[model samples]
Target: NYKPTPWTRADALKVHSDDPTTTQPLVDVAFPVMSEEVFIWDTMPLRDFDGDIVSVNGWCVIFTLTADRNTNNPDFQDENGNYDIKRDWEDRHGRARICYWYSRTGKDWIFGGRVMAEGVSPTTREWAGTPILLNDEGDIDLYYTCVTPGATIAKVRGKIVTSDEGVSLEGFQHVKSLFSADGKIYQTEEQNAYWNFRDPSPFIDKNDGKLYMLFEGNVAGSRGTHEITQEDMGSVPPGYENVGGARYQVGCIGLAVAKDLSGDEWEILPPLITAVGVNDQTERPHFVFQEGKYYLFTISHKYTFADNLTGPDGVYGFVSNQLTGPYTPMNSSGLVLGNPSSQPFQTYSHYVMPNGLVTSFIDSVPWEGEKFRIGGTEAPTVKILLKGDRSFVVDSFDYGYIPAMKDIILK
Candidate 1:
């Protein structure tokens, strides 16, 4: 009621659809996640450390996503660098299979790979989202989402091992509309969509030796774009005309529980996060364990508030006695991680300061005797071991990939 109209129903674009016409070249990513010092060596793809092993995945570009023109400010320009030379397929021997994404001359986001098997498998369509899982065998299997429409929401799935043969993916899963016991569609609401679109990351409860998959989903709201204010928006450029509009709406994270399927059964629990409206924009769900309890970190972007969606929003931490929460938000309501004086280093990290005021600290001057440690760890680096200016490694392990089992293959 306070601001101008935002993107209408026609402007609602699908980020994970398969139809070429429905796809929009990411007008360039404004903020990218998984950034670090090690990635500086190879920025074309996104990479991260999975404990002892390094895993990488990214777009087909000269620089990282944010470095691209659309996301960065006009003042921060850079030159187009050389692309990688696409490598031909080879016979797989006993070695680790490497995978990557390459854009063909005309089309984009086509995926191909070099298997540690007998030869190259034909490249398939690319999917977005990451999957990190621990099998019943206690091994890591990963998956991502790509929309082939008919294909189920379980798009890409694989269990990579140390064998020269690489990871073995049995198949993919498709999405089905929910139905009730009476065979009627489950229409209480669309809470099932969160469980339907999978972003598989492992949530290991070290205490019980149990591992599960975690993904994000949002609860829809009654309000749309009109409810927001003008002060919340940034200048909308022409190419982005489709997405440019003011709207006051937010989505929240939907948590679903997953059970291990032995290369066959597919399972998803309906999301318990059914909160509605503006306060619901808590999307990404990250986990950390401290002092015997589980903590889930969610970003609270003010989607309905002016300029809040595109700009930095606050990060909220919810704690619960269980992994699957009945989480209670801590601090006060609308407690963002930081304020004006201290801001987030980058939006990708979703990092926020606990307090608005910065406290003056002594540089080893005040607490020389107290045990105090600061800073993050190094090593387990992953990157796009690029061949030239054109090709890339979608998922690569740094140092190298090791196995959970010495020599066991599931039957």
Candidate 2:
């Protein structure tokens, strides 16, 4: 009953929706970040050796890109009018590759180059997530979620030989330092049959001055669980009394410690928080320490809300004073920003920047009930103002993203 506030149905009901009506966008970002046909998603900033977001030329960001915007083309529709998004978008071109973009002005961008093909590797098939970087001298050490050809989600580390400018990713080496889930703390794909245990983000706890990793996972030792621990919860969490069976709730934020910051060795720890009966896939879980408050944020989709819980596809957050325990849900519901029900799919996958601005990609824009065009470029950013335990979107910017400053640096 006294955990880092579980994301419950009551909180889901509080998410703000019903955005105003809008039409086609004026400034198309696709041409700037990637080609018209290519789409990008899941972006991260390139850091200098000291871990400050390197602004040598401007700002450098690495984004995942793949061709063919019409992955859901009408030609792929079945007789009943259903198409396999898994086959088209999820599994395309063998896999989506990482591409670097240098934006001198934060608005205008220049494509630096590709990151992996220099050394033929299998991780290229699925090197995804908010990939973090540690630039040691001349070499760049990388950490990200690497999906295997057999479709197993894994955490792995690799190396990058950057050019003299450190702008373009020249050569790569798959270090083969694969990290696995310990069955006691994190649910494994083979043993417990859960699909979390990815999204490995590295950070140094200012309170302890030690290196640690934050990630997404499912509550272990609770296979097929769809309800909270009865004794602790007292009963069904308020609005979820009649909620039916749905195996989509065991999501949690995972934690680990690093023996060496640049090495693959890490020790798994208990989950930071669990949402066992609330929702599935608290995707892209990460932390933001601001004003002496530890702000934990992640994104979730409406489709993954367990049982009768409901919210839009957007960013959610919680706050705490310590690095661990006793976090309160922001805005009473943990929702920071949500797509209005009018255009629920307009944007997705938000990452809170170092400067309090939240960045997201244009996912889809709906004209009617089912009509939408895929947008794979950076979306305009909205700045969130955080008080002791509450947050609000006070200002909006024109996609002028500046990565985190040390005040909250996870570098």
Candidate 3:
């Protein structure tokens, strides 16, 4: 997997930069997109080892929860209506935990309670990051970014009992560490905690019959120059060679393989693809095997781009004919779906369903003249059509849509 298809300065320049969303703004919603009782984000539906969305009694999802109600402010308005909100996400992220919700029909949900962190001291509590649940033989294998009490990234595992009664995922085994950045093929928090090492997604490759997990991480070494070189940097944008130093960028999709999906042994391998020098933070990486082709998709923000590169805050992707390969960016520039410039902070953390439907959380929506509001709920789901090497959004679906199994033939 280390063959590494580099998304370099050359590839970044092809984007031609679109300020398109500036006019296509998302209409403001006064409440959370998922529900009125609670605010949720970073959602993943339960899937079998084959990566097909499945339901025990009904469809299930695990996500990060903040409060019982949505936080409607985005531009930091204070008591006196002052723009004073600070570290908005930091505060919520610190308190968020992995919570599960189940629906008999994919539309309505019932809170299933916290999946992990049930017995720890409230004083020294750990938080949760994007979660992925795997259903194996009636038992659930939960894998998620475990943030230590303070703010270090780790992985934890557990079980979710599924039956006619419902779904129950708690008592996670956080005692034994699953895996961490080893500082060789991947960057370590010890070197730079500022970058990513979280938001893991797992899939089993039919080609090798081995389970693979992908996550966000910097290229090894304390510096971005660790595994990359100026030549590997490709062609740089005119004045950016010195400004951003393309060779000094390290954003990548770290990969790991395991012979057993329910086993404790997993080996950290090289990155499958990288956005080195082009962008940092490839959040929530995963794969979609459709019609015999592998689609590797990841989410990134514009602020995370290098000085010379600019793109929308949405999902970007690449395609490969094989499980491991030299992949090619989709839509010419690797931009699958981007937020309209008018609502740049509108929706984020896009999750592509294997059946072509895409889901995301509403982040920030434009409101009155200079102020905005937080859309701490699920965004309307959309569908994309994928060709041999190209893909694009083809239609829109009902809000929080999960394709019915009858509508899918199990790719």
Best candidate according to TM-score: 3
Model 1 lDDT tens row, 85-196: 1110011111112333232121122333321122221223222233343332323333333232321224233443322322333322332221111101111123332222
Candidate 3: residue 203 Cα off by (Å): 1.6
Query: Could you arrange the candidates by lDDT from highest to lowest?
Result: 3, 2, 1
Model 1 residue runs over 4 Å out of place are 1-128, 131-140, 147-198, 204-211, 220-250, 259-267, 270-275, 304-311, 334-346, 349-411
Please write out the lDDT profile of model 3 over residues 84-121, one tens digit for every residue.
Answer: 42345435565565677776667656678776655532
TM for every model, in the order presented, reads 0.40, 0.81, 0.84
Candidate number achieving the greatest lDDT relative to the actual structure: 3
Comparing candidate 1 with candidate 2, which one achieves the higher lDDT?
2
Superposed on all Cα atoms, model 3 deviates from the true structure by an RMSD in Å of 4.4
